[PDB]
């Protein structure tokens, strides 16, 4: 017959675990009322920052764009973009705009 | 330093009196460069390349 009480924690998800790095180098341009501590949720804005990696190629998009390039042309400069780093929802603000995204 | 190259890039065609096109162009080149948009304020302002 057994009858044993074992000391046990409450700790985080660590499959619930998310680390969040800038995809290419920039310099911060704001950051948010936020430190370690604080409970944030899905969407909460971490920071603003300014990245010049893909500026170049977005160009040669717009560029694409004026002179209506090939579809599998654009289809190309643009999957290079998401393949540089940039975020695919980025992305879709560079199309709609037609202008170059930095911050 | 190395915001100069570019600097006189720009100072050279306010001389060359370059459209507002292809000046704003650099200065733009300058602010993803990293330079204080207030440091290239006073760049305008005094059409000299700051180096401090």
């Known amino acids: 017959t057994f009858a ?3 000391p046990a924690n409450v700790s985080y998800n660590e499959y619930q ?5 800038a995809r290419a180098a920039g310099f911060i341009d704001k950051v948010y009322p936020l430190t370690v ?10 920071l603003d920052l300014t990245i010049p ?3 170049e190629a977005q160009s040669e998009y717009l560029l694409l764009r004026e002179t209506g390039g090939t579809a ?3 289809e ?3 999957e290079r973009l ?3 780093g940039m975020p695919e929802a980025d992305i879709r603000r560079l199309i709609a705009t037609q202008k170059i995204q930095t911050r």
């Open 4 to 6: 044993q009480s074992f």
């Open 17 to 21: 675990y998310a680390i969040v790095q």
């Open 37 to 46: 501590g604080d409970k944030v949720q899905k969407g909460t804005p971490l």
């Open 53 to 55: 990696d893909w500026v």
């Open 72 to 74: 599998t042309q654009t």
């Open 76 to 78: 190309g400069i643009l």
């Open 82 to 84: 998401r393949l540089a």
